[PDB]
Amino acid sequence: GNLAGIMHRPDSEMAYVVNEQTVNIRLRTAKDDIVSVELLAGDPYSLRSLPTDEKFYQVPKQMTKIMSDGISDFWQVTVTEPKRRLAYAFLVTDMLGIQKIYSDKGFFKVADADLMDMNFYFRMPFFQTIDQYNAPEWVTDTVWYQIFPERFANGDVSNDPVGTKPWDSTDHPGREDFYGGDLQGILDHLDHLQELGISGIYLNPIFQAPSNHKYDTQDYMTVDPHFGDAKLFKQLVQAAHERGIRVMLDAVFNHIGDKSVQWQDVLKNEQASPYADWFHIHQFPATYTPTDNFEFAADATYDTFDYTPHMPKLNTSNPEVVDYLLNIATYWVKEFDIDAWRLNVANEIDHHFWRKFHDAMMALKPDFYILGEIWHTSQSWLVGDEFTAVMNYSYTGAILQYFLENESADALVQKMSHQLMLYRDATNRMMFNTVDSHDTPRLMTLAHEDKQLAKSILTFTFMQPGVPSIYYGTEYGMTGENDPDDRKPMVWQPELQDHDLYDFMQKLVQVRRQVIAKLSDDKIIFDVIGERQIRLTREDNQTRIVGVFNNGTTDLTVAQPTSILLKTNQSETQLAPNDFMIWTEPVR
């Protein structure tokens, strides 16, 4: 009995409200150390207040071992209680047959447990739906497409910045290059987006900013003049909505650009500036020593994003900053009807501000989607009062490491199970899955131009619980290393486009939207069936979707499925190295 490996944290992802009378409860144990876990649960007041001789601890509820991360096992159970008050404890039995009760009071023999004392148990005191996590349903049926607007399509040469280069997808872009992409180009290629089958557009920042990336905001209340104007953006949003495509914008609230009005005021008036307290200035005047790298300063007298002097950090604890940012976030939603906000460097802004932001957005749109850009563990931002989800960088990163390196299938399945057990079930369905972006090398480059490997990575990711996204140009096999090489002008020429990959992407998106998205309360199972061989199963009460991935150096034979949805090998039974097959079957 590895008692040190057993843990339950109440009022957490291990004990949360699903609906008015229902809760989900989890227990962590040491891997393969516990053979069974039962839950003793009921109304805490029923023990001594009800005249009945029956007590809730006399009818245990069996828990199911749902996941394992190589170190711990994870058990779960769902409990319904009409009184909406729950006290609970765990009955754990290990390999040697040693059984103990685990409660808020610790570990006991069942004979020594004070089961009649309501304060012996862990507690969910009252099922508070106002405190619970809620997931917007529409996100479940979405496949996103990420657009870096400067490089997607130039629909208007008239607004091009000075020195705009000729549109060349084969170019290796420089850090300060401009190609002239704008909102009119996105409006022009909405038909390509709809033919691909995507139902959501994620835009990198489009607010006035001097750079090609626009993360150094100059004015949050105005669309960049090179990109277009307010009327054109409203037209774009309405056309997207007409095509059944939702819109998500990028909010850069952790820092502002140095060319912004507030910062220039700070540079002119120093401490006498009204915006001095909008920033984190250690010493006046706000200064820094320039270096050869434009994005690096070693001795700035003010806090900044990374070590770049051009992005002074905003003081989100200042009430004036709070009001300003909330007004911006409310303005874009209320005036242009956007569907989601993507929060840049969301982890470096305080929870207090995010709580206010969540309240404002939900007061505007109850089904709003708040996505946080965080690379590490975000349990504190996904309780239900702040973000809906975060970018699932660790999940897709583990997937990429498995497919590109020679790691065992067990390692990948353990990493994915750890990730899933970090959060609530619905939160897991809201996580944002992308294999590359404007900050990482392109998938085709990562796969060393191995198309089959890229198809396998994309299919494996699209089968995951989170919502998938396609970085612009992935559907045509665009290559590139890290930024700025991952921001090449979009390949609009047919001679340079991979049409086979585009056809495959259309089929993959169709499988995601017509099959995996229509599963009802599906369960996910990871099975390691051999060295670098994985069987993924998503299963609801009526239908089951199975995908087998052969990433070994040998052929793999499977029983012939009756209805194959997607496969790369011509055979219906044999899988060569890097092949995969997806099929569907009724539950029996």
Ligand X SMILES: OC[C@H]1O[C@H](O[C@H]2[C@H](O)[C@@H](O)[C@@H](O)O[C@@H]2CO)[C@H](O)[C@@H](O)[C@@H]1O
Contact set with a second copy (CB under 8 A): 2-5, 7, 9-12, 29-31, 33, 45, 49-51, 69, 71-72, 83-85, 104-107, 118-119, 121-123, 125-126, 128-131, 296, 298, 303, 306-307, 317, 347-352, 355, 375-377, 379-380, 385, 393-394, 415, 418
550 neighbors 459 (Cβ within 8 angstroms): no
Identity of the residue numbered 51 = P
Which class for 257: exposed (0-12), middle (13-18), buried (19 or more C-beta within 10 A)? Answer: buried
Minimum separation from the CB atom of position 438 to ligand X (A): 6
Cα–Cα distance measured from residue 381 to residue 469, given in angstroms and rounded to the nearest whole number: 21
Minimum separation from the CB atom of position 208 to Ca ion (A): 15
Minimum separation from the CB atom of position 204 to ligand X (A): 8
Cα–Cα distance measured from residue 539 to residue 372, given in angstroms and rounded to the nearest whole number: 29
Minimum separation from the CB atom of position 345 to ligand X (A): 5
Instruction: Map residues 305-344 to x or -, x wherever contact with ligand X holds by CB under 6 A.
Output: x--x-----------------------------------x
308 neighbors 295 (Cβ within 8 angstroms): yes
Name the binder of 180 from Ca ion, ligand X, a second copy, none, CB < 5-8 A by kind.
Ca ion
Cα–Cα distance measured from residue 228 to residue 234, given in angstroms and rounded to the nearest whole number: 11
Instruction: Map residues 184-213 to x or -, x wherever contact with ligand X holds by CB under 6 A.
Output: -----------------------------x
Minimum separation from the CB atom of position 49 to a second copy (A): 5
DSSP assignment of 225-280 equals: TTT--HHHHHHHHHHHHHTT-EEEEEE--SB--TTSHHHHHHHHHGGGSTTGGGB-
Instruction: Map residues 520-559 to x or -, x wherever contact with Ca ion holds by CB under 5 A.
Output: ----------------------------------------
Is 141 a binding residue for ligand X by CB under 6 A? The answer is: no
Is 188 a binding residue for Ca ion by CB under 5 A? The answer is: no
Name the residue nearer to ligand X (CB basis): 483 or 485: 483
Minimum separation from the CB atom of position 146 to Ca ion (A): 19
Is 295 a binding residue for ligand X by CB under 6 A? The answer is: yes
Which class for 370: exposed (0-12), middle (13-18), buried (19 or more C-beta within 10 A)? Answer: buried
In Å, what is the CA distance from 290 to each residue of 284, 294, 299, 470?
Answer: 17, 7, 9, 38
Instruction: Map residues 458-487 to x or -, x wherever contact with ligand X holds by CB under 6 A.
Output: -------------------------x----
Instruction: Map residues 251-280 to x or -, x wherever contact with ligand X holds by CB under 6 A.
Output: -x----------------------------
- Angle at CA 140, nearest 5°, toward 503 and 518? 75
Q: What are phi and psi of 418, to 5 degrees?
A: -55, -50
Name the binder of 336 from Ca ion, ligand X, a second copy, none, CB < 5-8 A by kind.
none
Q: What share of the chain is helix, strand, coil (3-state, %, to 5)?
A: 30, 25, 45
β-strand partners of 550: 533
What are the tokens at 312? 């002074």
Residue 393: closest CA among 469, 451, 450, 448: 469
Name the residue nearer to ligand X (CB basis): 102 or 178: 178
Cα–Cα distance measured from residue 223 to residue 208, given in angstroms and rounded to the nearest whole number: 6
Instruction: Looking at residues 156 to 185 of the shown chain, list those that interact with Ca ion (rule: CB under 5 A).
Output: 156, 159-160, 180, 182
Interface residues with ligand X (CB under 6 A) are 213, 215, 252, 295, 305, 308, 344-345, 373, 438-439, 483
